[PDB]
Design a protein around this ligand. Structure first.
Ligand code: HEM
Length: 439
């Protein structure tokens, strides 16, 4: 028939809330999913969502004729600062489709155009590590953030954040992390955020004052949509700046940190990746063409996104009354949340060793089922920056693996911090230079 949907214990008016009393709500939900399976309902005072974990259900939810992108409480909390820019706009808001057509050509060909500036920041990362004394170590996510922020600032906006000239995190990041944490904390509330938003806006004006006195910024200021013919308004443009400075770097830093984490934890995987880097990256600096030949480095990165997709959930709503999976009636407006780390652990797809780090799972991707691997979201609301993220990550990891041997000197225990994105907090390593000349 039509089944009761599983649901964890409720606690009077508190609903299911006392079950997410944590700074790590996604990891908590993954445990509820392990217990209750492919679908469960979750209620907090005033609001209700349904968490999906199977490819069979997610495949249905990904049917855009039936479900569209929802702004979850977390993205509503975020719309305050990025407005109706691409990430926090509803698909039916005019600026969504409009920015999408106006911005999409900036993301392979734009990539060729971005390569050199990606290499500029990546060489700054390598030089930093080459210059460390023997007694020193690397703070991995902290340096990855320095890299990915500087990369978007330069490739997107021709602005230099100069992150590597500071040994504290950039002033822009510190607000960012506190605003993301606060949006996440706000979630477990039954009943500085202005300061952090103002500090972000503060930087946007710097950028805006800069071009004033061929890249993303160009297309934001000058580009017009081949439908309505209308350009972006200034309000929206400020909104797209803020948007690309966050999503533009946080998830990719997380990815590169998880990737190095898994490599040091899997020395045979590391060996094979380093072997490819050396034979492929024969020039002083890498070319666009060489980065494209780093087949096993891309498999490594995809397998890190499989385990810990760094933007770990996306939210959908029923466009109309519908039945999910031939069993679960939903009313127009009902929220579904896709738990991507749980999707990537669906044993009917992946086999029964879902926790192991095996890049060879991606050896021939043209044989992974559709909707089984979704680290970049779904459909027309999928990550516009997918190829940019991947090219950057593959370039940088490739250069890292060419130029150094890595040591897990603290025997680091994975600790994943959640700011509605994921990163391995406190991950540190030592890197011994192979003493290989740069350009
Ligand atoms: C590994 C790195 C990345 C991951 C895992 C990731 C993940 C995602 C996911 C899952 C979504 C869908 C959000 C939702 O459905 O609510 C998304 C959307 C988006 N992402 Fe990414 N992202 C990454 C890198 C980037 C980069 C480098 C950029 C920009 C340069 C970026 C820009 C965006 C934008 C603008 C959107 C909204 C797209 C739209 O709705 O039109 N992402 N991303």
């Amino acid at each position: 028939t039509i089944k009761e949907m599983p649901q964890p214990k409720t606690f009077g008016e508190l609903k299911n809330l006392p079950l997410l009393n944590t700074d790590k709500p996604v990891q908590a939900l993954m445990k509820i999913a392990d217990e209750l399976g492919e679908i469960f309902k979750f209620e907090a005072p005033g609001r209700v969502t349904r968490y999906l974990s199977s490819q069979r259900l997610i495949k249905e939810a990904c049917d855009e004729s039936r479900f569209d992108k929802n702004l979850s409480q977390a993205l509503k909390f975020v719309r305050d600062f990025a407005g109706d820019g691409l990430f926090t706009s509803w698909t039916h808001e005019k600026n969504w489709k409009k920015a999408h057509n106006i911005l999409l050509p900036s993301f392979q060909q734009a990539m060729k155009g971005y390569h050199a500036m990606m290499v500029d920041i990546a060489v700054q990362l390598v030089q930093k590590w080459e210059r460390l004394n023997a007694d020193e170590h690397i703070e991995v996510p902290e340096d990855m953030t320095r890299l990915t922020l500087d990369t978007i600032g330069l490739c997107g906006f021709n602005y230099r954040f100069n992150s590597f000239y500071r040994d504290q995190p950039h002033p822009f990041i510190t607000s960012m992390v506190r605003a993301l944490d606060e949006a996440m904390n706000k979630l477990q509330r039954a009943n500085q955020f202005q300061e952090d938003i103002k500090v972000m806006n503060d930087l946007v004006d710097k950028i805006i004052a800069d071009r004033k006195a061929d890249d993303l910024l160009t297309h934001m200021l000058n580009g017009k949509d081949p439908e309505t013919g209308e350009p972006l308004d200034d309000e929206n443009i400020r909104y797209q700046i803020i948007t690309f400075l966050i999503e533009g770097h946080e998830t990719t830093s997380g990815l590169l940190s998880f990737a190095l984490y898994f490599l040091v934890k899997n020395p045979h995987v590391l060996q094979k990746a380093a072997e490819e880097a050396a034979r492929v990256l024969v020039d002083p600096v890498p070319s666009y063409k060489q980065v494209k030949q780093l087949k096993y480095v891309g498999m490594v990165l995809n397998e890190a996104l499989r385990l810990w997709p760094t933007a770990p959930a996306f939210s959908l709503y029923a466009k109309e009354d519908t039945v999910l999976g031939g069993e679960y009636p939903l009313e127009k407006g009902d929220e579904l949340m896709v738990l991507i780390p749980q999707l990537h652990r669906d044993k009917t797809i992946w086999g029964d060793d879902v926790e192991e780090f095996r890049p060879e799972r991606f050896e021939n991707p043209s044989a992974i089922p559709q909707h089984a691997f979704k680290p970049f979201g779904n459909g027309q609301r999928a990550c516009i920056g997918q190829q940019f993220a991947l090219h950057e990550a593959t370039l940088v990891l490739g250069m890292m693996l060419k130029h150094f041997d890595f040591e897990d000197h603290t025997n680091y225990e994975l600790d994943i911090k959640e700011t509605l994105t994921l990163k391995p907090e406190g991950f540190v390593v030592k890197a011994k230079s192979k003493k290989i000349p740069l350009g």
